[PDB]
Ligand binder design. Structure first.
Ligand SMILES: *[C@@H]1O[C@H](CO)[C@@H](O)[C@H](O)[C@H]1NC(C)=O
Lengths: 49, 29
C-alpha cells in the first residue's frame, strides 16, 4: 500500500523502463489509471502493476 | 490492470481455430 506524495495506491512496484520528463511525477494509463511513479528521493520510475 | 474487470481466455485458442478451419478446408478440397 504505497503512498507517494499524494498517490495512495495499492500495487506491486516494478523497476520500469519509462523515461519521464524531468518535471513529470507519475504516469497515467489510457483509461485514467495510474501506471507509474517517480520515486521522489531516487529519480527512478517504478511501474504499478 | 483493471479494477476487478478481468478477461478470460477463449477455450479454443487461435492456433486450434486455425486447425479447425484447416480441417474444414482440407475436407472441402
Ligand atoms: C535524497 O537524499 C539522498 C541522500 O540521503 C540522495 O541520494 C538522493 O539523491 C536525494 N534525492 C534527490 C531527489 O536528490
Amino acid at each position: 500500500n504505497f503512498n507517494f506524495n499524494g498517490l495512495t495506491g495499492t500495487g506491486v512496484l516494478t523497476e520500469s523502463n519509462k523515461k519521464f520528463l524531468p518535471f513529470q511525477q507519475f504516469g497515467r494509463d489510457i483509461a485514467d489509471t495510474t501506471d507509474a511513479v517517480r520515486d521522489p528521493q531516487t529519480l527512478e520510475i517504478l511501474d504499478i502493476t | 490492470k483493471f479494477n476487478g474487470l478481468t478477461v478470460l481466455p477463449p477455450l479454443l485458442t487461435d492456433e486450434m481455430i486455425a486447425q479447425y478451419t484447416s480441417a474444414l478446408l482440407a475436407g472441402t478440397i
